Structure formats: C-alpha cells, structure tokens
Amino acid sequence: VRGMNTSSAMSAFERMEEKVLMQESRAQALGELAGADLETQFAQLEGGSDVD
Amino acid sequence: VRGMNTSSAMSAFERMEEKVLMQESRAQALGELAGADLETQFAQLEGGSDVD
Numbered sequence: 675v676r677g678m679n680t681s682s683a684m685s686a687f688e689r690m691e692e693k694v695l696m697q698e699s700r701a702q703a704l705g706e707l708a709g710a711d712l713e714t715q716f717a718q719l720e721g722g723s724d725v726d
Numbered sequence: 727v728r729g730m731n732t733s734s735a736m737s738a739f740e741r742m743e744e745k746v747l748m749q750e751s752r753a754q755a756l757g758e759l760a761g762a763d764l765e766t767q768f769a770q771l772e773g774g775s776d777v778d
Contacts, residue, residue, distance in 0.1 A: 676759070676760055
C-alpha cells in the first residue's frame with residue numbers, strides 16, 4: 675500500500691517512465707527536425723500546386 | 727507463590743511482554759505511517775466522490 679522503492683511494481687513504473695519519456699521525446703524530436711528543414715515545408719507547397 | 731525470577735512462569739511472562747509490546751507497536755506504527763501520507767487521505771476523499 676505504501677508504494678515503497680523496494681516493492682517491484684513501484685520500481686518498474688519508475689524505470690519504464692524514464693525509458694518512455696526518452697523514447698517519446700526522441701521520436702518527436704526527429705519529426706520536428708524534418709519539419710524544421712525548408713525543403714519539407716516547400717514540398718507541402720508543391721503538393722498544393724500539384725493537385726489543382 | 728512468590729513469583730521469583732528463577733521460576734519459569736515469571737520469566738516467560740516478562741520475555742513475552744517485551745516481544746509483544748514491540749510487535750504490537752511496530753504493526754501500529756506501520757499503519758500510522760500509511761495514514762500520515764497525503765495520498766492515503768486523498769484516496770478516502772476520492773472514494774466518497776466515487777460512490778455517489
């Protein structure tokens with residue numbers, strides 16, 4: 675009930691959270707980098723021109 | 727009749743009492759610690775909200 679560090683469930687959650695945060699952030703960061711590049715933005719503009 | 731220290735019954739009671747007091751106090755202390763934590767108090771409040 676106390677949720678002490680020794681108990682397995684509490685330790686697992688903390689370990690999982692650190693890994694999850696890093697993984698989630700890394701995937702998002704990569705996407706942002708692609709978005710940041712001018713060419714990716716330009717490609718979207720090109721697509722709009724292309725469809726009409 | 728004298729209840730002298732040498733007699734087995736007197737010695738047993740004294741030894742048992744020390745162990746019993748420590749055991750009773752320790753169990754109670756653990757319960758108090760759980761009660762002391764804010765989350766346990768919060769859980770009771772949540773339960774009241776949950777039932778209605």
